[PDB]
Design an enzyme around this catalytic site. Structure first.
Site, PDB file in Angstrom:
ATOM      1  N   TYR A 125      62.192 -45.854  21.256  1.00  0.00           N
ATOM      2  CA  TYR A 125      60.860 -45.772  21.853  1.00  0.00           C
ATOM      3  C   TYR A 125      60.863 -44.995  23.188  1.00  0.00           C
ATOM      4  O   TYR A 125      59.792 -44.632  23.665  1.00  0.00           O
ATOM      5  CB  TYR A 125      60.214 -47.159  22.037  1.00  0.00           C
ATOM      6  CG  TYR A 125      60.932 -48.032  23.033  1.00  0.00           C
ATOM      7  CD1 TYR A 125      60.986 -47.680  24.394  1.00  0.00           C
ATOM      8  CD2 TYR A 125      61.590 -49.207  22.628  1.00  0.00           C
ATOM      9  CE1 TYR A 125      61.673 -48.474  25.326  1.00  0.00           C
ATOM     10  CE2 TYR A 125      62.278 -50.011  23.543  1.00  0.00           C
ATOM     11  CZ  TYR A 125      62.318 -49.648  24.892  1.00  0.00           C
ATOM     12  OH  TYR A 125      62.989 -50.429  25.814  1.00  0.00           O
ATOM     13  N   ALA A 164      67.372 -59.060  23.753  1.00  0.00           N
ATOM     14  CA  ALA A 164      66.277 -60.031  23.801  1.00  0.00           C
ATOM     15  C   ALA A 164      65.389 -59.819  22.563  1.00  0.00           C
ATOM     16  O   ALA A 164      65.313 -58.713  22.055  1.00  0.00           O
ATOM     17  CB  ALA A 164      65.451 -59.799  25.051  1.00  0.00           C
ATOM     18  N   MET A 214      63.678 -54.063  19.322  1.00  0.00           N
ATOM     19  CA  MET A 214      63.519 -52.624  19.209  1.00  0.00           C
ATOM     20  C   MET A 214      64.820 -51.882  19.416  1.00  0.00           C
ATOM     21  O   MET A 214      64.820 -50.681  19.746  1.00  0.00           O
ATOM     22  CB  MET A 214      62.449 -52.130  20.176  1.00  0.00           C
ATOM     23  CG  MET A 214      61.120 -52.937  20.056  1.00  0.00           C
ATOM     24  SD  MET A 214      59.870 -52.476  21.270  1.00  0.00           S
ATOM     25  CE  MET A 214      58.477 -53.580  20.898  1.00  0.00           C
ATOM     26  N   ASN A 268      60.536 -65.183  23.889  1.00  0.00           N
ATOM     27  CA  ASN A 268      59.128 -65.428  23.678  1.00  0.00           C
ATOM     28  C   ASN A 268      58.900 -65.731  22.216  1.00  0.00           C
ATOM     29  O   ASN A 268      59.706 -65.356  21.382  1.00  0.00           O
ATOM     30  CB  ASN A 268      58.284 -64.212  24.126  1.00  0.00           C
ATOM     31  CG  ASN A 268      58.646 -62.903  23.368  1.00  0.00           C
ATOM     32  OD1 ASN A 268      59.688 -62.272  23.604  1.00  0.00           O
ATOM     33  ND2 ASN A 268      57.772 -62.508  22.468  1.00  0.00           N
ATOM     34  N   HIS A 310      56.150 -58.071  29.243  1.00  0.00           N
ATOM     35  CA  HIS A 310      57.473 -57.738  29.763  1.00  0.00           C
ATOM     36  C   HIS A 310      57.961 -58.646  30.910  1.00  0.00           C
ATOM     37  O   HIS A 310      59.170 -58.887  31.046  1.00  0.00           O
ATOM     38  CB  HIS A 310      57.470 -56.278  30.222  1.00  0.00           C
ATOM     39  CG  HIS A 310      58.818 -55.746  30.612  1.00  0.00           C
ATOM     40  ND1 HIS A 310      59.940 -55.899  29.823  1.00  0.00           N
ATOM     41  CD2 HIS A 310      59.206 -55.017  31.684  1.00  0.00           C
ATOM     42  CE1 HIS A 310      60.967 -55.301  30.401  1.00  0.00           C
ATOM     43  NE2 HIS A 310      60.548 -54.761  31.532  1.00  0.00           N
TER      44      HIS A 310
HETATM   45  O1  22A Z   1      58.053 -59.957  20.921  1.00  0.00           O
HETATM   46  C1  22A Z   1      58.811 -58.960  20.939  1.00  0.00           C
HETATM   47  N1  22A Z   1      58.655 -57.938  20.066  1.00  0.00           N
HETATM   48  C2  22A Z   1      59.482 -56.874  20.043  1.00  0.00           C
HETATM   49  N2  22A Z   1      60.534 -56.761  20.867  1.00  0.00           N
HETATM   50  C3  22A Z   1      60.777 -57.747  21.770  1.00  0.00           C
HETATM   51  C4  22A Z   1      61.799 -57.896  22.689  1.00  0.00           C
HETATM   52  C5  22A Z   1      62.908 -56.931  23.026  1.00  0.00           C
HETATM   53  N3  22A Z   1      62.510 -56.242  24.255  1.00  0.00           N
HETATM   54  C6  22A Z   1      61.394 -55.291  24.225  1.00  0.00           C
HETATM   55  C7  22A Z   1      60.479 -55.350  25.461  1.00  0.00           C
HETATM   56  O2  22A Z   1      61.030 -56.073  26.578  1.00  0.00           O
HETATM   57  C8  22A Z   1      61.921 -53.875  24.034  1.00  0.00           C
HETATM   58  O3  22A Z   1      63.121 -53.624  24.797  1.00  0.00           O
HETATM   59  C9  22A Z   1      61.543 -59.115  23.340  1.00  0.00           C
HETATM   60  N4  22A Z   1      60.421 -59.761  22.873  1.00  0.00           N
HETATM   61  C10 22A Z   1      60.030 -58.948  21.743  1.00  0.00           C
END
Ligand code: 22A
Ligand code: 22A
Ligand code: 22A
Lengths: 286, 286, 286
Positions: free
Chosen positions: A88, A116, A219, A243, A257
């Site tokens: 991304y 995460a 991601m 989350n 975030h």
């Molecule tokens: O609910 C979510 N959806 C998609 N990706 C993530 C992530 C992984 N980190 C994201 C944004 O903090 C992309 O690096 C944490 N929570 C989720």
């Protein structure tokens, strides 16, 4: 299309690292935004900015890309990525996964990937750690696969298997290590789905991912796993549930975030200790 | 990869428009192939060919791209896109969605998106209008997301949420307006799935989309929604069901463009009145 | 983006072939890695290396791309592709499917596509042949569609239908021909899902594909089908089930290329005879 990196480029990067450090790691660790703190725990620690390393993907402001940190973690010779690349951000996957092949050429034989992720399993809770048993590579189904392009047999074959991606042994040994910590929350286990982002999923998207049998969504990670496996690295990894993805329309709450970074902070210590101890379960080489 | 447009480019396009029109819209409307006719209903109408506007995506035969039309619709200061861009024409999504950020910089604060779509819900009928409660961004899962690339905080954050994409308020107020019209068919509501096309779905593809919980399928809209939300626009929209997607193998009938255009014609008037009246439910600014 | 090939290029390639061969095929066959052997069965056989043909996609070592072979198969004027292009090799789809439009301009009116695939249907067995009733174009949902870009009406329309892709007639006539062979295994029929690869599916990915209602999974074919249909070719095809995709975690077995090639060998003869006989069921032209 083709991978922009020749075999010579990967070799060159490796030799530069071999030449600039006395360390010889066996274990590569990729710290997911969650646990960058893990570098405090290394000893004989030696740092390289990505920006100094030949052929490394670049960030526009060079330092924000991050650092390679060689050292010893619980008696294992490690190299850690502090900062990683996502699709991304605009990186093609052959850039996202360039370090992994550098690692292999460095003599590394195992990969630990952490990240995460948002919780799809309704029973998961913020703070939970979920071991990765499997993944669903949605971008891969469409063409976004780090191996797309001519194959170099020097790394691996044309059609590697991914059914055995996540080391069975390391996964049992990891359930062990968790009793050893004596924790109130049980160690979770499940399927990580990769999506490309960078925007967050809708309710309807979440329900789709739940119905694919995914337990967590992020991601990253999957491409590094595919490239690791392609060249023979043993792979283990896990996710920090930061989350619980929003699953119905009446809820007033939103994925953000700040609260992902916040959750990272709570499980900070916990994760370090965890990874640090796991080190000992990693077979020695030879 | 990166978005070809700098912040300066978006600013430049906006200022050119600010300079060439006395109008200051609050509402942007994107007319889906269905309802181009809506421009008749504006007053103090002022037209720009896309081809005259700096940085606008170009069509090979310049006029076929279409027109921006500023004016007043039912007391609201509007700007309408007559002609829009799809990814199946070859546009990267940062081109498809370029107007949306132009609009925001113009001071617009709401977006209305309309489109034609094929009916996945077995109970829908040709002629039905379906409000959009949610979407499933299939291309987005793979990497095709208009925000892919470096983020510019001047527009929005790195990881915006999409769970709240479609304004709850506007959706209730829209059910209101529909009783007001006194219609035999009820106002439908549901999930729009985007696919990229341009060929039509197979039976087996249709069944897949039904099982994802989608109600309608088209080839637009979602990217504009994501970019709108990213920079803070309120979003509402709906689809005209032009056809019921073929769902079993014995049927001799096929999805085609002629009958989609035809259906557009029936609901023509109906849609105009509808949108026109909805105008009044849009909060004033400040 | 746009297709790199102009209409003139396709015309040029066709005329070069028209000029270099006295043959005028009616039937094009694409031999899936399984059955390259089929070229032995042609008579009055005439071979061109892809590398000699103007505008043909190139392999880095030119000969490895393969050969066009004109001839007569069971009284039908055929042209066969021995060697084909996949998106996982790095080809954009407008290259993968370039031959198909060459064929049409050559006066071909039917396309036969064959491939190897992994079995998703739990009842299928290695050796089974599965007729293709339908497909699920996963890459197509994301944007990877051979028709992406400006449409040339000289080939077909903007939005062709795919619900009727696989000729109903040819499929019945093919069940006929199979009794005629007197086989112990029944002729299978079902949905082919395309994924891009080149790595093999995980357990969790397999379960996803099963739940989409797919029966077989491969990494080709669908794009050629879409382009064939777009320009009016009748299409029939089938898959050789070379392996049963791994569906649970306790299994110690892995999907691999050696055993796919091996399975190709068993069904070799069987497939030739089969296709060869099917030739007679193909309507004559006019
Ligand atoms: O609910 C979510 N959806 C998609 N990706 C993530 C992530 C992984 N980190 C994201 C944004 O903090 C992309 O690096 C944490 N929570 C989720
Ligand atoms: O059945 C369908 N499937 C996908 N898209 C559409 C649309 C939306 N318009 C299409 C072609 O008319 C792309 O702009 C209407 N019916 C359907
Ligand atoms: O299990 C499988 N999955 C995906 N593709 C295949 C195919 C089709 N051939 C592959 C690798 O041999 C790509 O050309 C056979 N078995 C399977």
């Amino acid at each position: 299309m083709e991978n922009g990196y020749t075999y010579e480029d990967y070799k060159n990067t490796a030799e530069w690292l071999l030449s600039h450090t006395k360390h010889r790691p066996q274990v590569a660790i990729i710290c997911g935004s969650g646990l960058g703190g893990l570098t405090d725990k290394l000893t004989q620690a030696q740092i390289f900015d990505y920006s100094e390393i030949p052929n490394f993907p670049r960030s526009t402001v060079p330092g924000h890309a991050g650092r390679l940190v060689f050292g010893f973690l619980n008696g294992r010779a490690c190299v850690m990525m502090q900062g990683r690349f996502h699709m991304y951000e605009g990186y093609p996957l052959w850039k996202v996964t360039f370090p992994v092949r550098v690692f292999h050429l460095l003599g590394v034989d195992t990969l630990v990937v952490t990240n995460a992720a948002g919780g799809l399993n309704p029973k998961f809770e913020v703070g939970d750690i979920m071991l990765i048993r499997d993944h669903i590579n949605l971008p891969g189904f469409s063409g976004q696969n780090p191996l797309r392009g001519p194959n170099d047999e020097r790394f691996g074959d044309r059609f590697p298997a991914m059914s055995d991606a996540y080391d069975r042994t390391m996964r049992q040994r990891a359930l062990s290590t968790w009793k050893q910590m004596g924790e109130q929350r049980e160690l979770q286990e499940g399927t990580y789905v990769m999506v490309a982002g960078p925007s967050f999923e809708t309710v309807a998207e979440c329900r789709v991912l739940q119905k694919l049998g995914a337990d967590a969504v992020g991601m990253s990670t999957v491409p590094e796993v595919i490239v690791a496996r392609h060249c023979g690295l043993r792979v283990f990894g896990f996710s920090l549930i930061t989350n619980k993805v929003i699953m119905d329309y009446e809820s007033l709450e939103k994925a953000n975030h700040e609260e992902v970074l916040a959750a990272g902070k709570q499980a900070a210590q916990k994760l370090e200790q965890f990874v640090s101890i796991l080190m000992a379960s990693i077979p020695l080489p030879d």
